[PDB]
Amino acid sequence: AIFASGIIMDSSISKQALSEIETRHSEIIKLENSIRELHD
């Protein structure tokens, strides 16, 4: 009966997937405003 159960350590939360995701989107606002003005 040699056997042993196992314990788990989740990683689905990365504290480094919040920096780039937020910084990336913060720059498209100016482009969207500029294109809206251009279309008007």
Binding site: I7, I8, M9, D10
Partner: protein, 83 residues
């Protein structure tokens, strides 16, 4: 004046079929306090690291909060460990 501290532990043992879980239930019902907590065997264990300790700690949160808030003049919280 005596400066004594109350006891906070009771253990019952004996062969199967004598009245341990009846005595515990009657004691829990007797006291005019908050409804007692109940644990059915090893129901606190979990799979993810560091969750059993959190479950154990959650049991005593209310008692610590009451002690901190109302000081000495506080109610009585009952915890019943089964098996």
């Amino acid at each position: 004046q005596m400066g004594c501290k109350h006891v906070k532990g009771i253990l019952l043992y004996g062969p199967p079929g004598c009245g341990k879980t009846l005595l515990a239930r009657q004691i829990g019902k007797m006291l005019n306090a908050r409804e007692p907590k109940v644990v059915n065997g090893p129901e606190i264990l979990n799979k993810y690291v560091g969750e059993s300790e959190a479950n154990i700690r959650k049991l005593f949160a209310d008692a610590e909060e009451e002690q901190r808030r109302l000081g000495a003049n506080s109610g009585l919280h009952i915890i019943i460990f089964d098996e």
